């Protein structure tokens, strides 16, 4: 029983195996019934196997054989446009996966030396995100909020926006998207894939699915294999964006496994090393230097808070790990503010370095006006009289708040974001009725695309507003506001 063992007991997805003396920690084993398992616990007289399937198959006396393999997943460009399970098996119903290689799930993150400072934007196409909380390539931007607030909507719009560049020739701009569905029901993933294919965003995307019915070890293991899939692009000089929807459900799966292995519980019964889990997952997102081919991997963790409680264990862990947060709130959602981002709580710690120079230029004072507006609104609510300057603050802030509204699956290019933020911040909207802002935007862009196309072309190709462009933009805004 050096390379084999036999089951002492089995239940609730855990098997206890006698023997397997030479097994490595976290090595895979195969039961004689054909179900596979992973040896999480090595103990003086036992091995604790967590099963990748129904424990109906395993029974006491079942013979167990070493695989000699740590978890690994196929990787390469052949996975693009495919849906794969936690171990890289195709589940979309199409042909096999043409792997360029295989990579272990648990892998050391790049150290201090390989990396380079984050300086390339991840253009989400969302006005609020790109203007106030920029995301850079190699950044780890948390998306956090209550149920049904728009977290997946934000990540999905970020994925959909990349179609502008993924059809181009410049391999340095193209961003390949991996989406990891953890604990979601398979029908939600099917709707997601039809959304991607309808917008034709699937041909550059990858879906890793560990849905609700799949054994707890697979829901645990999906983020790591998805990270290994994304890391091929990083390590071969390409760019990847990995969305972990949702890491809280992965933490729940690990709580299940750890509790059934009888590892000592911690706060809220989570195991004592869940921070080690999410940290060793998220540190793999990095921006590499020229010596390493300048590739990158960007992470967008999704965290579902309960009742807005950010003090909970996992929320605090991931907030303290990530490089910033996008906070979504239900109150803003029903007030009609979509994507409902709380721009006061949201923070990007990479900051303006990740922002397109044009949008940095025009968006500079937007943050100040919105902060002042949020401070002042209490005066209007409290029934107090308003000073002239506070009234001006309200008229500005309400229209800026209206201007950040955006419909689902309708991302904007930065050539389209810059004019809007410019017009709003310079106060050229202050005269328009608050109801008509949505009419303004749709018209103003239509105006610029028709009568001022040179400005949009130059903004896109240069990415920066020279004085001539800014003056022409001023003239165009004044022209159209004199509708």
């Amino acid at each position: 029983l050096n390379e084999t063992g036999r089951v002492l007991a089995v239940g609730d997805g855990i098997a206890r195996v006698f023997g397997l003396n030479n097994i490595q920690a976290e090595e895979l084993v195969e039961f004689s019934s054909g179900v596979k398992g992973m040896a999480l616990n090595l103990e003086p007289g036992q091995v604790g196997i967590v099963l990748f399937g129904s424990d109906r198959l395993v029974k006491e006396g079942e013979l167990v054989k070493r695989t000699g393999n740590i978890v690994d997943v196929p990787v390469g460009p052949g996975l693009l446009g495919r849906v794969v399970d936690a171990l890289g098996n195709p589940i979309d119903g199409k042909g096999p996966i043409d792997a360029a290689g295989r990579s272990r799930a648990q892998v050391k993150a790049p150290g201090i030396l390989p990396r380079r400072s984050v300086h390339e934007p991840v253009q989400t196409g969302l006005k609020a995100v790109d203007a106030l909380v920029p995301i850079g390539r190699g950044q780890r931007e948390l998306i956090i909020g209550d149920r049904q607030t728009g977290k997946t909507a934000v990540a999905l719009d970020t994925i959909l926006n990349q179609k502008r560049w993924n059809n181009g020739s410049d391999e340095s701009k193209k961003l390949y998207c991996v989406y990891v569905a953890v604990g979601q029901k398979r029908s939600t993933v099917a709707q997601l894939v039809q959304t991607l294919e309808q917008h034709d965003a699937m041909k550059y995307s990858i879906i890793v699915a560990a849905t609700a019915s799949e054994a707890a070890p697979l829901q645990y293991l999906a983020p790591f294999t998805a990270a290994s899939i994304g890391e091929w692009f990083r390590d071969n000089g390409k760019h990847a964006l990995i969305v972990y929807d949702d890491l809280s459900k992965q933490a729940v799966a690990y709580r299940q496994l750890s509790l059934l292995l009888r590892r000592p519980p911690g706060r809220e019964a989570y195991p004592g090393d869940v921070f080690y889990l999410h940290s060793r997952l998220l540190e793999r997102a990095a921006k590499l230097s020229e010596k390493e081919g300048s590739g990158s991997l960007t992470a967008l963790p999704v965290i579902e808070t309960q009742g807005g409680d950010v003090s909970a264990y996992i929320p605090t862990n991931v907030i303290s790990i990530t490089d910033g947060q996008i906070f979504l709130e239900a109150e803003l959602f029903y007030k009609g503010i979509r994507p409902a981002i709380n721009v006061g709580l949201s923070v990007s710690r990479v900051g303006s370095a990740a922002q397109v120079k044009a949008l940095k230029q025009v968006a500079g004072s937007l943050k100040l006006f919105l902060a002042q507006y949020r401070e002042v609104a209490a005066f209007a609510q409290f029934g107090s009289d308003l000073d002239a300057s506070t009234k001006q603050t309200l008229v500005r802030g309400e229209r800026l708040t209206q201007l950040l509204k955006q419909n689902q699956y309708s991302p904007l290019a930065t050539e389209e974001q810059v004019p809007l933020i410019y017009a709003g911040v310079n106060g050229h909207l202050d005269g328009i009725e608050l109801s008509r802002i949505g009419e303004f935007e749709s018209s103003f862009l239509s105006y610029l695309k028709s009568n001022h196309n040179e400005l949009l072309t130059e903004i896109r190709e240069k990415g920066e507003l020279s004085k001539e462009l800014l003056a022409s933009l001023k003239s165009a805004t004044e022209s159209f506001v004199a509708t």
């Binding site: 979601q184 029903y334 007030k335 029934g383």
Partner: protein
């Protein structure tokens, strides 16, 4: 046959020792002879030393250590097919309507794998319920998954019976109702109402199958009856190829039942005492309910909310599994606003401008904006009162109050104890009425004219009756 001896009995849990070393596989059904007839136990774990730990599907009282156990050689299996229509079935599949054996040619195990990813089918067709708040702010989807959330005594049961009454006849396919740990009185009431309205017909063709594991049952039964309901519904979906309504009341009782046995099975308790396996157990159950390319299942589920705490792990984890949600609230109920649906927390996938059109979406979004403003002004209204509000805030609060009261509606089922005649409202009529209310056309109507009526026509008529 394979036989064993009972060695331990604790609550619903029984340990069986098999001297014949070929142990029964997990989930196998085991049988003990008793004066009641057979007692059925389900294998849950293998403990080692030829001992298996099992969950009793009925009361363990009267068991004696050393009592003989027979292995059935398979999981709990229940009748399927059209022979189950018009009949009431026990958890272990026995009839309890006292009309004799169920003569189905096939009998299927209650434990089965969910459909694969490739088998999923998705659609965006509105299921008109006739209920103003649902049809306006949280439309239901045919072939989708629907969940009522609500604490004790808010009206989950009356809402479920209203949905049954409205939708069963219009559906025209087959139906399955699974009572999971809910009131036996209401099981009898549903049975007699169905038998009187002809959807059940003891002398002819019936279109609904009933399964009941009501709340008087031990946790072992409550933890499995839902799977029997699922098995009959899945047989209709896959083998008959029909379209199926699947009602479950109350699915939380499934999760709760597992918790009751979780400690006895030797697991370390999870947060607030739930079993570690809560998430995966509920996934394994609920994602069998999905519609597939073989057929459509439109499942309506009632979810209990312990202590009105929506953050409780069970409701919180159940939220992830639904296309439409209807959060009943005690706060709304105390206002007398039945059916007590929370118009802001209630949410649906199909409230999408591409599905319901731009007009419906605009009306619903404006309604929710008005209601959210009114809720944001609650503290000010309480402390300073109406006078100090901005004038347009006064107007918004008045329209929000009228919208609140206009979302109430009398169901025919509640007529027994409300005394208000039942009322039903079409979707287009609802949208038109709320668009009219938003546009200020009825600002001059007193707000009590909006309470417990259906359609703006009844609002004006009640305005006349209040003016008299």
């Amino acid at each position: 046959p394979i036989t064993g001896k009972v060695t331990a009995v604790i609550g619903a849990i029984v340990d069986v020792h098999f001297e014949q070393s070929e142990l029964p596989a997990i989930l196998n059904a085991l049988e003990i002879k008793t004066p009641q007839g057979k007692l059925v136990l389900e294998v849950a774990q293998h403990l080692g030393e030829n001992t298996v730990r099992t969950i009793a599907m009925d009361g363990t009282e009267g068991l004696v250590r050393g009592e003989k156990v027979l292995d059935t050689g398979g999981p709990i299996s229940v009748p399927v097919g059209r022979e189950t229509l018009g009949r009431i079935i026990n958890v272990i599949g026995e009839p309890i309507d006292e009309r004799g054996p169920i003569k189905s040619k096939l009998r299927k195990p209650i434990h089965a794998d969910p459909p694969s990813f490739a088998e999923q089918s998705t659609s965006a067709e509105i299921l008109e319920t006739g209920i103003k708040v649902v049809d306006l702010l949280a439309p239901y989807a045919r072939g989708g998954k629907i969940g009522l959330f609500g604490g004790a005594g808010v009206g989950k049961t009356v809402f479920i019976q209203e949905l049954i009454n409205n939708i069963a006849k219009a559906h025209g396919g087959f139906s399955v109702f699974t009572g999971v740990g809910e009131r036996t009185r209401e099981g009898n009431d549903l049975y007699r109402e169905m038998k009187e309205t002809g959807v059940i017909n003891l002398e002819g063709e019936s279109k609904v199958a009933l399964v009941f594991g009501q709340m008087n049952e031990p946790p072992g039964a409550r933890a499995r009856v839902a799977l029997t309901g699922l098995t009959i519904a899945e047989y209709f979906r896959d083998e008959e190829g029909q379209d199926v309504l699947l009602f479950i009341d109350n699915i939380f009782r499934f999760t709760q039942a597992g918790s009751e046995v979780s400690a006895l099975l030797g697991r370390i308790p999870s947060a607030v005492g739930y079993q570690p396996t809560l998430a995966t157990d509920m996934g394994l159950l609920q994602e069998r309910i999905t519609t597939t390319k073989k057929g459509s299942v439109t499942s309506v589920q009632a979810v209990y909310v312990p202590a009105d705490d929506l953050t409780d792990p069970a409701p919180a984890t159940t939220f992830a599994h639904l296309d439409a949600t209807t959060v009943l609230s005690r706060g709304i109920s105390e206002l007398g606003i039945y059916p007590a649906v929370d118009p802001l927390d209630s949410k649906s996938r199909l409230l999408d401008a591409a599905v319901v059109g731009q007009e419906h979406y605009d009306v619903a979004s404006k309604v929710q904006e008005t209601l959210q403003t009114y809720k944001s002004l609650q503290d000010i209204i309480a402390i300073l009162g109406m006078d100090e509000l901005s004038e347009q805030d006064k107007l918004t609060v008045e329209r929000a109050r009228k919208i609140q009261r206009f979302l109430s509606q009398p169901f025919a089922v509640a007529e027994v104890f409300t005394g208000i005649p039942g009322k039903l409202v079409r979707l287009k009529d609802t949208v038109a009425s709320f668009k009219a209310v938003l546009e200020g056309k009825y600002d001059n109507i007193p707000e009590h004219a909006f309470y417990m009526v259906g359609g703006i026509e009844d609002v004006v008529a009640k305005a006349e009756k209040l003016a008299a």
